[PDB]
Amino acid sequence: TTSASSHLNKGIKQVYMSLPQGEKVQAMYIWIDGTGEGLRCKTRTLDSEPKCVEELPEWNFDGSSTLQSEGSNSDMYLVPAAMFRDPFRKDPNKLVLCEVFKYNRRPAETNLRHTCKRIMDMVSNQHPWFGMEQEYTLMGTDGHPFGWPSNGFPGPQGPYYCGVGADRAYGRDIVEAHYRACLYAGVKIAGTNAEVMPAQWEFQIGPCEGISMGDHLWVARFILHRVCEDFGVIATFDPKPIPGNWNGAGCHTNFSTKAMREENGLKYIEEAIEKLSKRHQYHIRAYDPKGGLDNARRLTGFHETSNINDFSAGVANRSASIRIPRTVGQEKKGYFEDRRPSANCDPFSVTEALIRTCLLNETGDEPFQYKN
Amino acid sequence: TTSASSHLNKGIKQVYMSLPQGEKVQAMYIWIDGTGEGLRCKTRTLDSEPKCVEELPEWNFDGSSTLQSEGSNSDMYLVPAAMFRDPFRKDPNKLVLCEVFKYNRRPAETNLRHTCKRIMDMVSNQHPWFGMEQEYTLMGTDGHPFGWPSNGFPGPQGPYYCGVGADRAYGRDIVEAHYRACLYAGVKIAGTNAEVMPAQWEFQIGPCEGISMGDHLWVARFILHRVCEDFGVIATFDPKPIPGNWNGAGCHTNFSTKAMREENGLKYIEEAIEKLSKRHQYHIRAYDPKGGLDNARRLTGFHETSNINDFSAGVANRSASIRIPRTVGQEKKGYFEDRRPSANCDPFSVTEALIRTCLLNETGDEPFQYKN
Amino acid sequence: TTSASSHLNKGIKQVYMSLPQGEKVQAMYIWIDGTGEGLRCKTRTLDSEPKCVEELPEWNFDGSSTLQSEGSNSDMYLVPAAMFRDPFRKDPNKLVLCEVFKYNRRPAETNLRHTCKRIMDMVSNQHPWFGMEQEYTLMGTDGHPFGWPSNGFPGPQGPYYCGVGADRAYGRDIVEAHYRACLYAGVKIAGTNAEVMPAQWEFQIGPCEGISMGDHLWVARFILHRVCEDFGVIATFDPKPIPGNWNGAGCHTNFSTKAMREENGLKYIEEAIEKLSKRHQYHIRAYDPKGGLDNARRLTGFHETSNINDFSAGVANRSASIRIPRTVGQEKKGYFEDRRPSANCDPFSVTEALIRTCLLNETGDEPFQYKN
Amino acid sequence: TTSASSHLNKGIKQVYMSLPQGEKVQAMYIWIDGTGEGLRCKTRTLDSEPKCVEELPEWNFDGSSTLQSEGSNSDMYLVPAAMFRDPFRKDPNKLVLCEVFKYNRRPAETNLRHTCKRIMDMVSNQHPWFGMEQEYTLMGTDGHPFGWPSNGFPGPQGPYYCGVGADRAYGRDIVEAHYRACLYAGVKIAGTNAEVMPAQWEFQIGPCEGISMGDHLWVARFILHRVCEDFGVIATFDPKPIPGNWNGAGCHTNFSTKAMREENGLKYIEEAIEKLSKRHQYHIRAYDPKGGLDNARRLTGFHETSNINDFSAGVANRSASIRIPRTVGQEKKGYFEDRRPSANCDPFSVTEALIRTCLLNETGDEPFQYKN
Amino acid sequence: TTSASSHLNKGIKQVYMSLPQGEKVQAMYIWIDGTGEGLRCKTRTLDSEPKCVEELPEWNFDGSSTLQSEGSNSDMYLVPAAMFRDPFRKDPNKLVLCEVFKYNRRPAETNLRHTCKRIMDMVSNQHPWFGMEQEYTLMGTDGHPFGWPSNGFPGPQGPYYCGVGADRAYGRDIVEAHYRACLYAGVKIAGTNAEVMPAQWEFQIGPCEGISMGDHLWVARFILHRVCEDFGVIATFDPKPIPGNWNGAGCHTNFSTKAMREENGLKYIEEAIEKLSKRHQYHIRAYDPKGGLDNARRLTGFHETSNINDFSAGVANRSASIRIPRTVGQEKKGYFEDRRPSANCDPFSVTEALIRTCLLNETGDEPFQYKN
Ligand SMILES: Nc1ncnc2c1ncn2[C@@H]1O[C@H](COP(=O)(O)OP(=O)(O)OP(=O)(O)O)[C@@H](O)[C@H]1O
Ligand SMILES: Nc1ncnc2c1ncn2[C@@H]1O[C@H](COP(=O)(O)OP(=O)(O)OP(=O)(O)O)[C@@H](O)[C@H]1O
Ligand SMILES: Nc1ncnc2c1ncn2[C@@H]1O[C@H](COP(=O)(O)OP(=O)(O)OP(=O)(O)O)[C@@H](O)[C@H]1O
Ligand SMILES: Nc1ncnc2c1ncn2[C@@H]1O[C@H](COP(=O)(O)OP(=O)(O)OP(=O)(O)O)[C@@H](O)[C@H]1O
Ligand SMILES: Nc1ncnc2c1ncn2[C@@H]1O[C@H](COP(=O)(O)OP(=O)(O)OP(=O)(O)O)[C@@H](O)[C@H]1O
Ligand SMILES: [Mg+2]
Ligand SMILES: [Mg+2]
Ligand SMILES: [Mg+2]
Ligand SMILES: [Mg+2]
Ligand SMILES: [Mg+2]
Ligand SMILES: [Mg+2]
Ligand SMILES: [Mg+2]
Ligand SMILES: [Mg+2]
Ligand SMILES: [Mg+2]
Ligand SMILES: [Mg+2]
């Protein structure tokens, strides 16, 4: 079933949304809350359209309502970081992604962009590109996957992957709407496909340079939640939404530098993979908002997945931790794919770890403080 | 859960509202009734579009149907005070807020704008600015909060504040429609956010100078009721809609003068707070249409509220009666927030009390009969 | 009777699809999976609008999710073959039909276009024209024909063929939508009619030259499946959807050469039919994805059908395996109709067999390996 | 008589400008050449629309063709400083005002904005406002005022000031076009009027804060020249275009600070005028691109002008060098007017002199090198 | 001063061009005639819009009317090479640049693209980029520069370079129209500026890869001639249109390879310049349609030009044959500028010579024949 809000008359809402706006402009501020997984938002009115992110004012919120601050000193501060066009209200209104700071101006516990940005600036001449494949499952308000038989299961897997038809693909209206909204907003969405599990979907973001990878994915996540709210369904990024013989959800991360993209760049790809082979446990902890417990329910070495305990790598191997595409090996240049991150990973944490291990030559179980 | 009127075919209505109007103009007169909380309205046809509020004629209504008039002499009179564009019928139609007068031209019992306007004119050179935060709860026609489980409760508080998603925010269609309608009408709406309680919302009005603060909030209240009527739900301003461990509803009032907004204006902010500390009982009575009984169900000292019995003030203190924002204290200028008024307060009463205590230096338990 | 996805608010989706796209372009890649009858699809973003099919890049997919490869070396490759406008997303977005190749660049088992194209190039100067009549039945998600009484049957056949009215034709909305979408996309749709069975329909594609007949029919099949997904119903190409005294579903194929279309071309029509009479078993095997088992449930010699194991031909005979239209016989030129292929046939298999038997004079029960 | 270019078919040009642009954007770079009075421009293509001035790249030009560079090291560099919308090409095309730097990155001789900007940054908290009244004369290509009798004169002065009618105002089409173009571009144009001499006009720019005054006036001058080019006439800023009993052209500059604009600000107005009284020769030198020679032909003490030799100030005195408006004197606050600058002054030089005499308390005949 | 055709009523023509086209499409074929500098054009009707250049048919013309063939065997053939949108007729009509072949299918004498294309295919992995600055002078039909005084001269040079105003820039309507038409057609126009001589202008094309530089410049030349035909003026590419102390017209060519554009690419820039120093006479011959006689009237060592019979090179030297920009020298990467080609050069001849000398290491006075 769907939510009570989705049963309201949507034609009424569009009549009000058709009213000409006038001179004022709406800006929606978006930030990550104390769980490191959820998003929050609210709107303020501006006198004129902002042209760049630098001319948006700072804002604030009460951190005791988001489990981010204690009692006495509960005020937290929002600092705009990236701006996009608003697909839900249209031009000239904006979406604003913000960094969160405590009352004493130190970064919040779940503010991982502050450290990630400094790391990205250390290797800016190498031009790192990232590409992330975000998988998710559409859910009903009753906790069951959308379009599944009530208290039951659909047919066995096999016909749902990249499927077409009323009996093969569930919820394509959400997917189509999310795709168009991202393109309007300016998010670098690269494609979509239906997944092995019915009502499971995937969209790809990238290639993005540096810190902009995390900014684009978080805004894409927000747009998906807001679109699903209109239809009355829930999108979940849980790695294993359904137990048993049903496909899980991950966030594959593709990585490349300027050196790897040039001729005979496969040599630098092999060197990065060698460095990654020595830090398996460090990346497992960084690829999860809970230190790796979430990914354990998904990475068991079955259904085209790698083992949580073991590191493996190979060309055109979809059962390994790291996969080199057959085309990349054939042309001796390109990129490589990290298949370990879970679907609920923080992109800032994932991208920072890749830079530290591969480009800054860090060792040990702790990140090196200041420089590399 | 929703009204029978909201199940009518809204597409039929839109066809009729698409008919070109012609030369005549509709004007809707709005006034406050004998309970001091309710609004009333009716429509007349004008020959041409009025350019200013002074061009609108006086009107009348039967006061025995609104519990505002005695038996024999029942006629009451409407005097236009402020004009806005009508978002429900579009240009050139208008909304008109009116003052209510008795058959002998004395102001009605619930007509509090008449005295508030004269007080505002006494301090016009100090340029008082007001900002009010209106909280409300969306309810179904069955007396239960909209989108709540039937005869039950949702999950515990914590994820609903500034939330996004089908399972976190209830009734955002109403909020979006109300925001755009106010902008079209000319109401100075400053922003909105979702509140701690699911289906609870807040919108900010201001900063407004003098008597215009009361006019803008009352018209914003009317627009919200009329928008909710289209969707078939009820908006309530009751301070404590749900007993127990559920968030209440208030109307925080922000106040500043020309002296407070200049450099080193924090000195004048502290002076006003000192004067307010001596008149706690006077402001409690003025901040409620019932005299304080309504606010007693909300101001108990828990859920980030101050006690109804005690006066407290501090910088960045959200549990005190008066709060100075940290940024204001750091820059030594700005405004201060009064967190005592209830969500169903009359803005004309609230703003008049602040001017009398802080700018006219009044004492005692009664207002000064003539001027100050 | 209809899917859960079809009960979502479609007005919401159209609001998002009204957003201006911008500079990027969506391309949907379509291919045939390992069962030989099902279609698959996924979408990628391009930087600018492609003008010809040669400008589209190659792509890939995981073949272990489509039963087209197992174990290691499961990656498959997609090569664009034909391009059409996208009726579901409108200009400048595109639909792309692709050929499938395995990891070593050999054609896949169900890739029959690769051999069919080379055969058509060997007879290019004779300009073969094909026309195919695709029959299908609309079904509810419960496995029963759409609009049929629950656990029951409608009235006896006879009033449904080419019928009009609420009690005679079921599902015309799908038929009208499919017709317009095909015209927009560029598919050579020639007409439609209602069939003997209620909820059964037919559309004609052609006349198409050479390899383009297979491309046009497959894309028309995809468009039909995607349109039915919007309405929440299933379109089936099963030869005998309902057992007993109810009409079956076939795919009649009309064939002509340049010599056949000229004056006194009936001589070459009779020559081709004579050659077809000697290869009945070879064409039965090639007219079915199961080698003839599916067509056995349909071709029993009743309800205006030919016998599965007997070959017959005649002028104006609708019970024979090959029919010469009376107009063609009178004018001594034109085409002829093969009524044996089943509704779920692969068009590349059907067209290739006709060329081999009639134009290349092949004999035996195997196709000639090299040219001719 | 008018230019040959203006006799070309303008309808032909408008057909070409109706063609849709596409994705590329034109940017016109504008700078001041070696004479200190003339403007230069050229256009480049950009890949996408820039949102702020900081996104525009640096450019260069050959300084030996503009007489501000030597032979061997003639390359000069352009640094964008302010961006406006282009009224001649419309959105999304831009106008860019730039600063000029030598090959060794030192400012050019006529680059007066570099020093003026630093002076404005050390009085930023006082918020200086400027308003300038630019007078000009429209001239034919034959060197005679536009619309004047051939080899002769019109009637005596008196009916032309703020005149209407074919025999009173010459060239209102240029004035109307210039007013609209400035509003579209974002130039803060405040008004226009016809002047005492026929074919003489005036437009007012402001009030502008700090360094913005120079940028807005220079761009307004460029727009005027470009508009006159379309009509085939010449706009001249020469202080005395016609000898004898005909009105001259000035550039009255209005000045105020935050203290001047507050209650009892007349005290600070009188303070600044006292400081200006002892630096008359310094300001005459700075109010002219030739050190004062040009203004000598205009400021002779006749036709409502002050003498070039002596300093005078008074309330409501239009014959004095400094004039206090009567309303300002009555309300005891506001601004004051400097009537000395000639119509061909550089605004960066004029505004810099006012601030460092009235706000930084400089003395002597040379500017202070550091800070002040 | 202008053509008789330009005095016809252009409003009449625009009425006919407003008629809806229908289904047919116009295609204008363009080629270079026997003088090596002039262009010819011809229009045919097509049944449907062509999507790529490969689907346009071959055409022919009578070569004895263009002095390209002898008497008996005079038929020539046109082969499409590049396609652009038509700015004079708008979509869906096209411009088609063609190669010319003799009756025996051998390339014509002035067909230099055929050899240039094969040379560019030998170095395609080095990605050569070209950028050309085309200078031209606008002339009246009487043989005098447009807007110049009859039988006379304007003022001395110096105020016309990058000038604005009726007395400074002549013919900007043509320049603006040409700019917009090129953007619509798809020509990579990079910018424009006014030149030292009044009525002299320049537009830049590039950066273009490989053979596309010749196609883009030739089509830009055609568009300029056709635009000037509308206004009734002549555009000339003669190197020295006016004898004496008036600037000439050149076609400076900028060149870069992939190695030159990478870090420390200045090393490969110096190597190419070193090779160019040995082949001055060979490049002088190839930079002129008449072998060098035209460029002799321009390259005399005065007015910022190099000597015709002397080679020089330097950083930031505008008087040398080859100039290295100062920014390129400082960043140690980029491109370099060849200032020797005259304004009437053939771009295919110019680009081919640069590749042969710098990338293929050719020596001697003749090009290498055996495909190298
Ligand atoms: N050079 C590159 N550097 C970084 N990321 C890249 C690069 N090139 C492509 N990518 C990214 O790689 C991703 C490609 O993954 P995609 O989902 O298309 O295929 P796949 O990984 O083979 O599929 P599957 O879902 O079966 O694993 C995209 O997000 C794309 O943006
Ligand atoms: N100078 C001012 N004078 C008066 N009101 C002001 C002034 N500046 C801002 N305001 C008003 O103060 C209000 C700000 O309240 P807002 O809801 O944004 O934040 P808050 O009080 O921190 O939040 P919360 O709901 O958590 O208490 C607005 O209504 C705004 O118009
Ligand atoms: N010369 C030709 N060569 C090939 N196909 C042709 C030729 N002329 C027509 N056709 C095709 O023949 C088909 C005719 O199908 P149609 O549905 O009209 O047949 P019908 O005679 O009404 O038969 P039925 O009752 O079995 O449906 C069309 O698909 C048309 O494109
Ligand atoms: N507070 C202020 N500070 C600075 N400039 C100001 C201020 N207020 C107004 N101005 C400017 O003063 C100028 C007034 O010019 P205006 O031509 O209207 O004056 P005027 O009295 O008619 O003069 P005149 O008769 O000599 O033309 C405008 O450019 C306006 O922007
Ligand atoms: N890397 C490159 N390779 C080749 N051409 C390039 C490259 N970068 C820029 N160009 C081209 O160089 C040209 C620069 O011409 P431009 O008119 O700006 O030169 P300039 O320095 O102003 O010289 P001039 O004073 O002689 O006109 C453009 O046509 C541009 O496309
Ligand atoms: Mg993927
Ligand atoms: Mg992947
Ligand atoms: Mg608030
Ligand atoms: Mg508050
Ligand atoms: Mg048929
Ligand atoms: Mg048939
Ligand atoms: Mg004036
Ligand atoms: Mg003045
Ligand atoms: Mg140039
Ligand atoms: Mg030049």
Side-chain angles (χ1 to χ4, degrees), chain A residues 67-80:
Chain A
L67 288 186
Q68 285 184 105
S69 67
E70 62 266 40
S72 176
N73 291 279
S74 78
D75 51 300
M76 311 270 285
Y77 295 93
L78 297 161
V79 176

PDB file of all heavy atoms in Angstrom, chain A residues 67-80:
ATOM      1  N   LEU A  67      19.465  14.694  16.672  1.00  0.00           N
ATOM      2  CA  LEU A  67      20.454  13.865  17.365  1.00  0.00           C
ATOM      3  C   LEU A  67      21.878  14.208  16.928  1.00  0.00           C
ATOM      4  O   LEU A  67      22.695  13.332  16.639  1.00  0.00           O
ATOM      5  CB  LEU A  67      20.164  12.375  17.164  1.00  0.00           C
ATOM      6  CG  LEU A  67      18.954  11.812  17.913  1.00  0.00           C
ATOM      7  CD1 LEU A  67      18.875  10.305  17.745  1.00  0.00           C
ATOM      8  CD2 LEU A  67      19.002  12.193  19.385  1.00  0.00           C
ATOM      9  N   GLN A  68      22.174  15.508  16.883  1.00  0.00           N
ATOM     10  CA  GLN A  68      23.497  15.977  16.503  1.00  0.00           C
ATOM     11  C   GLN A  68      24.138  16.897  17.532  1.00  0.00           C
ATOM     12  O   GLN A  68      25.295  17.288  17.346  1.00  0.00           O
ATOM     13  CB  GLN A  68      23.442  16.696  15.146  1.00  0.00           C
ATOM     14  CG  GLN A  68      23.300  15.751  13.968  1.00  0.00           C
ATOM     15  CD  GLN A  68      23.333  16.455  12.627  1.00  0.00           C
ATOM     16  OE1 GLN A  68      24.330  16.396  11.907  1.00  0.00           O
ATOM     17  NE2 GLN A  68      22.238  17.115  12.279  1.00  0.00           N
ATOM     18  N   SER A  69      23.433  17.250  18.603  1.00  0.00           N
ATOM     19  CA  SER A  69      23.986  18.137  19.615  1.00  0.00           C
ATOM     20  C   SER A  69      23.292  17.881  20.944  1.00  0.00           C
ATOM     21  O   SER A  69      22.187  17.335  20.998  1.00  0.00           O
ATOM     22  CB  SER A  69      23.845  19.607  19.207  1.00  0.00           C
ATOM     23  OG  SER A  69      22.485  19.992  19.186  1.00  0.00           O
ATOM     24  N   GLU A  70      23.959  18.289  22.021  1.00  0.00           N
ATOM     25  CA  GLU A  70      23.450  18.098  23.373  1.00  0.00           C
ATOM     26  C   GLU A  70      22.443  19.196  23.713  1.00  0.00           C
ATOM     27  O   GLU A  70      22.004  19.966  22.854  1.00  0.00           O
ATOM     28  CB  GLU A  70      24.604  18.049  24.371  1.00  0.00           C
ATOM     29  CG  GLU A  70      25.427  19.324  24.434  1.00  0.00           C
ATOM     30  CD  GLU A  70      26.645  19.274  23.533  1.00  0.00           C
ATOM     31  OE1 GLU A  70      26.531  18.744  22.407  1.00  0.00           O
ATOM     32  OE2 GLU A  70      27.716  19.760  23.952  1.00  0.00           O
ATOM     33  N   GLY A  71      22.071  19.278  24.987  1.00  0.00           N
ATOM     34  CA  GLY A  71      21.017  20.169  25.433  1.00  0.00           C
ATOM     35  C   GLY A  71      21.333  21.651  25.412  1.00  0.00           C
ATOM     36  O   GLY A  71      20.695  22.411  24.676  1.00  0.00           O
ATOM     37  N   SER A  72      22.306  22.078  26.221  1.00  0.00           N
ATOM     38  CA  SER A  72      22.526  23.507  26.433  1.00  0.00           C
ATOM     39  C   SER A  72      22.941  24.210  25.146  1.00  0.00           C
ATOM     40  O   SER A  72      22.331  25.208  24.746  1.00  0.00           O
ATOM     41  CB  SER A  72      23.577  23.716  27.524  1.00  0.00           C
ATOM     42  OG  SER A  72      23.875  25.091  27.685  1.00  0.00           O
ATOM     43  N   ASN A  73      23.971  23.702  24.479  1.00  0.00           N
ATOM     44  CA  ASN A  73      24.476  24.283  23.236  1.00  0.00           C
ATOM     45  C   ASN A  73      24.018  23.384  22.092  1.00  0.00           C
ATOM     46  O   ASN A  73      24.741  22.485  21.660  1.00  0.00           O
ATOM     47  CB  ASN A  73      25.995  24.430  23.273  1.00  0.00           C
ATOM     48  CG  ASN A  73      26.454  25.483  24.263  1.00  0.00           C
ATOM     49  OD1 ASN A  73      26.431  26.678  23.969  1.00  0.00           O
ATOM     50  ND2 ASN A  73      26.872  25.044  25.445  1.00  0.00           N
ATOM     51  N   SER A  74      22.807  23.639  21.595  1.00  0.00           N
ATOM     52  CA  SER A  74      22.190  22.785  20.593  1.00  0.00           C
ATOM     53  C   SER A  74      22.158  23.392  19.197  1.00  0.00           C
ATOM     54  O   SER A  74      21.853  22.672  18.240  1.00  0.00           O
ATOM     55  CB  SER A  74      20.760  22.420  21.018  1.00  0.00           C
ATOM     56  OG  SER A  74      19.863  23.492  20.787  1.00  0.00           O
ATOM     57  N   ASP A  75      22.464  24.678  19.048  1.00  0.00           N
ATOM     58  CA  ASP A  75      22.413  25.310  17.736  1.00  0.00           C
ATOM     59  C   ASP A  75      23.536  24.790  16.846  1.00  0.00           C
ATOM     60  O   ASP A  75      24.692  24.702  17.269  1.00  0.00           O
ATOM     61  CB  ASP A  75      22.503  26.829  17.874  1.00  0.00           C
ATOM     62  CG  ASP A  75      23.681  27.273  18.725  1.00  0.00           C
ATOM     63  OD1 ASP A  75      23.743  26.888  19.910  1.00  0.00           O
ATOM     64  OD2 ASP A  75      24.541  28.013  18.207  1.00  0.00           O
ATOM     65  N   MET A  76      23.189  24.440  15.609  1.00  0.00           N
ATOM     66  CA  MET A  76      24.145  24.013  14.600  1.00  0.00           C
ATOM     67  C   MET A  76      24.041  24.944  13.401  1.00  0.00           C
ATOM     68  O   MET A  76      23.037  25.638  13.228  1.00  0.00           O
ATOM     69  CB  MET A  76      23.899  22.560  14.173  1.00  0.00           C
ATOM     70  CG  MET A  76      23.739  21.597  15.340  1.00  0.00           C
ATOM     71  SD  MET A  76      25.294  20.876  15.896  1.00  0.00           S
ATOM     72  CE  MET A  76      25.615  19.677  14.608  1.00  0.00           C
ATOM     73  N   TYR A  77      25.081  24.964  12.573  1.00  0.00           N
ATOM     74  CA  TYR A  77      25.184  25.931  11.490  1.00  0.00           C
ATOM     75  C   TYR A  77      25.327  25.226  10.148  1.00  0.00           C
ATOM     76  O   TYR A  77      25.980  24.184  10.046  1.00  0.00           O
ATOM     77  CB  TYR A  77      26.357  26.882  11.731  1.00  0.00           C
ATOM     78  CG  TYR A  77      26.140  27.745  12.950  1.00  0.00           C
ATOM     79  CD1 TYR A  77      26.623  27.358  14.194  1.00  0.00           C
ATOM     80  CD2 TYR A  77      25.414  28.924  12.867  1.00  0.00           C
ATOM     81  CE1 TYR A  77      26.409  28.136  15.315  1.00  0.00           C
ATOM     82  CE2 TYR A  77      25.196  29.708  13.979  1.00  0.00           C
ATOM     83  CZ  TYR A  77      25.694  29.311  15.201  1.00  0.00           C
ATOM     84  OH  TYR A  77      25.477  30.093  16.311  1.00  0.00           O
ATOM     85  N   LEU A  78      24.703  25.804   9.124  1.00  0.00           N
ATOM     86  CA  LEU A  78      24.704  25.264   7.770  1.00  0.00           C
ATOM     87  C   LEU A  78      25.512  26.190   6.872  1.00  0.00           C
ATOM     88  O   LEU A  78      25.304  27.407   6.882  1.00  0.00           O
ATOM     89  CB  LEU A  78      23.276  25.117   7.241  1.00  0.00           C
ATOM     90  CG  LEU A  78      22.350  24.143   7.974  1.00  0.00           C
ATOM     91  CD1 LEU A  78      20.890  24.435   7.655  1.00  0.00           C
ATOM     92  CD2 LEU A  78      22.695  22.703   7.640  1.00  0.00           C
ATOM     93  N   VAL A  79      26.426  25.617   6.098  1.00  0.00           N
ATOM     94  CA  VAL A  79      27.276  26.364   5.180  1.00  0.00           C
ATOM     95  C   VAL A  79      27.067  25.807   3.776  1.00  0.00           C
ATOM     96  O   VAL A  79      27.408  24.650   3.517  1.00  0.00           O
ATOM     97  CB  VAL A  79      28.760  26.296   5.579  1.00  0.00           C
ATOM     98  CG1 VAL A  79      29.619  27.007   4.547  1.00  0.00           C
ATOM     99  CG2 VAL A  79      28.967  26.899   6.960  1.00  0.00           C
ATOM    100  N   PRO A  80      26.508  26.582   2.847  1.00  0.00           N
ATOM    101  CA  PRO A  80      26.270  26.067   1.491  1.00  0.00           C
ATOM    102  C   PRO A  80      27.554  25.607   0.813  1.00  0.00           C
ATOM    103  O   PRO A  80      28.608  26.230   0.946  1.00  0.00           O
ATOM    104  CB  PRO A  80      25.658  27.269   0.766  1.00  0.00           C
ATOM    105  CG  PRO A  80      24.999  28.050   1.840  1.00  0.00           C
ATOM    106  CD  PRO A  80      25.863  27.889   3.063  1.00  0.00           C
TER     107      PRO A  80
END
